[PDB]
Amino acid sequence: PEINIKAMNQAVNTIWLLAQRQTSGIEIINDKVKRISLYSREFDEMMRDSLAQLAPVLKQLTSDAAFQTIAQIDEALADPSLSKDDREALTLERNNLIQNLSKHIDNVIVSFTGRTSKLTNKISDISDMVIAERLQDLVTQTESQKTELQSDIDPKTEKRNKLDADREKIIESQDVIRQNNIADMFKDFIPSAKDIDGLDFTQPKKEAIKQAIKQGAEIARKILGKVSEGLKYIDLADARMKLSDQIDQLITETDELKAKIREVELRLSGLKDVMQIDTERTTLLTEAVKIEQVWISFAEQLHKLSNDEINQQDLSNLINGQLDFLNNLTLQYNKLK
């Protein structure tokens, strides 16, 4: 049964990473993620240690003293010139040694099962953990909010364009007024249509100037709400600057909405990270379950051999196969480093 420890350790590490770099503000999810990352790191360390620790326990069984001794007992029992008292004594020695070997194998199975059981309990601590209920709905809510924020932003850009166009018209009027120094001719109030129309330059020049000045004045009065008859230059300049400040108000609003979009997108990223955490957890848990099943089958077969007696060679093949397997896993672990 081939197992990929590389994927297991890489999933553990990615889980830790994503927990470290998760940006979603939910306190519950943050706490749960921290807990699961700690459980996974504890499990990685405990697995490394369990592999390094288990091989000696099984190794002790193969080099059991009682086996060569049993052989020597049988050798002695091969002698015909022996008393039935001594024969039964040696027979009891052999049978007792078989009983001690079985007892020792059971003690080994208990120790091995305990070591594996601690890992199993940690795997259970990991699996039982639930990050959040129906996360996909949370992601849906977050993306819906992001869409709503963008849809509320777009009209702000359109309105900024309209006010900027109005500012352009107003400042055109101001700069052209100074260009022709009209302020000096009509210093008290803006010249009416007839007043400017009566004198100077060309009818195209006159008409262009009139349209520009009237456009500026109309926009200014509309912004300030006063009627056209006010005809004051100061009203024009005041409206210009006041509309510009309103544009700055729009900039403030837009910056706030952009910051909220930043938070929402950051959150969505965090949630995606949590989903990837769950996926990597699944990846890890699959390999862990495979190793657990391997070890349980091994323990069952070893219990079967304990129930049966002697049969040293097949037992050695079993234990050595398991040791080679453990060494394979340890080698796989060491390779990644």
Numbering used by the authors: 14 to 350
Would you copy out the relevant sentences from the publication that reported this structure?
α-Xenorhabdolysin is a PFT that has been first isolated from the bacterium Xenorhabdus nematophila. Xenorhabdolysins are also found in other entomopathogenic bacteria, such as Photorhabdus luminescens, and human pathogenic bacteria, such as Yersinia enterocolitica and Proteus mirabilis. They are composed of two subunits, namely XaxA (45 kDa) and XaxB (40 kDa) and are only active when the two components act together. Xenorhabdolysins, which were suggested to be binary toxins, perforate the membranes of erythrocytes, insect granulocytes and phagocytes and induce apoptosis. In contrast to previous predictions, XaxAB is therefore not a typical binary toxin, but rather a bi-component α-PFT.
